[model samples]
Target: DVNELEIGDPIPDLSLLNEDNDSISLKKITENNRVVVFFVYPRASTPGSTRQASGFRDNYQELKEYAAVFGLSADSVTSQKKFQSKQNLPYHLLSDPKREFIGLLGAKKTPLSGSIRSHFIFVDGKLKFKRVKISPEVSVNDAKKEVLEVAEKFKE
Candidate 1:
């Protein structure tokens, strides 16, 4: 059985292509003890995925104050970009065509199947919370609540 990534596990940073097909460093953004959120979906332009993306989009302003948010999917930048524009999302969408990064996050169910719908919250480059095979709104709410709680702790 695959040992899925769990809370307290060290997360590896992968330089992946975003909606613009430009490589971004997950490491750099995740530094400074910053909170980071990555919601992983099976594909872009799908209804379920879009709902999840939109949930995060609607909560972007508050989330951004505490974390750097990004959307992840197996779809290419072509599809990711289209999805972004169509939704008018404020956060960047990440593309992992080969599924390398998603798999490491334990999104894949099998060797050849698409990734599972999941969401993850990282605080200071470490996994703080994660959910797999969850509904769109639940995933968004869970991540939102988690980051908000983490943010509250940063107050003096």
Candidate 2:
């Protein structure tokens, strides 16, 4: 099942629109590079979401030296564009309006069901890491720490 993709599994090829309204394929994006694909909530300005996005924003350039960084949410292109611009996020922020792609990733939704808070790392098109199952009340710091750890691994 697509939902069962594990570490070392080949990431599924799916095309989604980015903040620029351009279609981006996971395979195409990850081709010949490592990628950190993080699935998050609606937009990045909310307190929790902002913290998570900011964490990535702060380390984006460092991460890029070794791989591309991407963020996914069930937001529209308009919303994603706004969030990316406001946060000054350098990496691509993908819009998964239907949440189907993240559903396949098996990320859990927030308690209020606003969005999923999770992240994954892929290397050369193969998934190499994912965070531990997150609790509903989990802090954004958990996601941040895991992301940094994944980025550090790529730099080694």
Candidate 3:
């Protein structure tokens, strides 16, 4: 589980694609900045997921002042593009459709499925916070509070 990550532990190097289908490496982009990484189920248009996306979208500019936020899901790039456009999010929406990254992180999946809802925060390349097995209903709001609080601390 993501909880196993100790404070100050180096974040695992992750290479994934962004909404634009651009390759991104966690260690590279977030070396000296704060980053919020969250995982959810497929697609963003779903009611719960869209709400979740909006929570971040709503706070994006504020978040940008302190850190970068990246939302991950097992969705395709095309789907991510549509979601990003529809919601007008200023952050990256990453797609890990194969769930390879999900498996590597050892996150808990849904009760009867292979996908999970999780969030992790890294500061200057170190893993500092994580949330696992979050319920869809509360995940986004929970993430908003966590990202802002942690990013604030990391900034100081």
Candidate 4:
């Protein structure tokens, strides 16, 4: 069963590694940015993952203006590095092989026990929006829309 975390919930201070193998804490990013886009996927280097990552990468400039976009997965740091480099993703891809943050976000585990596709938007250190179990086909555009909408409100 998914433990759906809701809006207004305080984002957990999960520590994970980024593409550069640098340790980063969720609180650190949230403290510095007014918004954050945290998207999680099952794996790396797959077509669906590729599409989702590319969609974010393609529209990163706009998204970056409003938030820090991060891609998370159970994939190892090496895999994340390859995927980020291969996709030329402007944002960091976080490694969560232990599924600590993934489970906290209410992402369902696949039959293989991998993280399902999920997206979350945090505004000022609290969750403002979330879409869980999103299909890879629509994950990108769907997340982009939600993030932009919330970000617009932040600016107002």
Candidate 5:
């Protein structure tokens, strides 16, 4: 069900392609007990998308201190790979051309050209924060802001 995921709900185990074309499991990524952010964007390499992804690439040192980052888009593996290398992204890029995770996250917009700019943070496999229809810059900031709160308390 689209839009069914809520805070405290665990994401389902689903297979999706990484930039390298390897099948990666959603559950497996969250198994480490670290805060994880799944930032959903419309497409890769577009102007806005490039800025958003690059922001993460630049602030990864700070963000990774509190959370693991993954860039999700409905672009193909080849396109995702191109964008990843081109930007020198340190995080994994999920290729969901079929909308497996995109549709599940309600990030997909049917009959529309672009998907919603959604940001999600999962802690210990359960959703902690989610915001849809937000700006690219704000989405990444929210993830950092939310994840830092969780990780800070853990480190204390």
Candidate 6:
């Protein structure tokens, strides 16, 4: 289970296609940025998912200062693209219909068989914070707080 991935665990090098259908390597991105904030949602365009995505989008500028943000879902590339365009999300929305990387991250599955909404913050190539099975509202607030707190430590 992804729950087994502890705070000190180094995130495995993974790659996935972004909303633009461009391949992105997790290792490469983290190499350039001190932190990486990756959030996973159940599906695209749903109320809860929309709230979560918008929360990230709305605070993107401030959040970007701490880490490079990315959103992941089991939705299709076309669906992810629409969500990104409609919500004006500034970060990449990765398509994970196969649940390959999602499973690797240990994101839980909802009772309804959907992906549990979760956020993972990787700082300096290691897992810094992880919050799973949270509400859309809590997901954003908690993630922002975690990133801010970690960024503070990095700045010191």
Q: What is the lDDT of candidate 6?
A: 0.86
Candidate 3 lDDT, 1-156, residue by residue in tens: 434455677766778898899997867867756565554554567876787788778877776776678878878888998998998988888888766566555563743346666666666677666666776646666766766777567545
Best by lDDT: 4
lDDT tens per residue, model 1, 16-128: 99999899887776785479888998888888998999999999987877888999988989999999999999999999888877887888867786888988888878888
Quote the positional error of residue 1 for candidate 4 in Å.
Answer: 7.6
1-156: candidate 4 lDDT, tens digit per residue: 355578899889779999899999999899999889899888999988998899999889888877899999999999999999999999999998878888888885853478889899888899988888888757788778887788678656
List clashing residue pairs in candidate 6.
2-106
What are the Cα lDDT values of the candidates? 0.85, 0.69, 0.70, 0.87, 0.84, 0.86
Q: Which residue pairs in model 2 clash with each other?
A: none
The TM-score obtained by model 2 is: 0.79
Error of 2 at 71 (Å): 1.1
lDDT value for model 4: 0.87
List candidate 2 segments past 4 Å from native. 108-114, 132-156
Report the C-alpha lDDT of model 5 over 26-125, residue by residue, as the tens digit. 8988997478888998999998898889988988988877778999988989999999999999999998877777777767777444578888888889
User: For model 6, what is the alpha-carbon lDDT of residue 4?
Assistant: 57
Error of 4 at 36 (Å): 0.4
Which scores greater on TM-score, model 3 or model 6?
6
Backbone clashes, each candidate = 0, 0, 0, 0, 0, 1
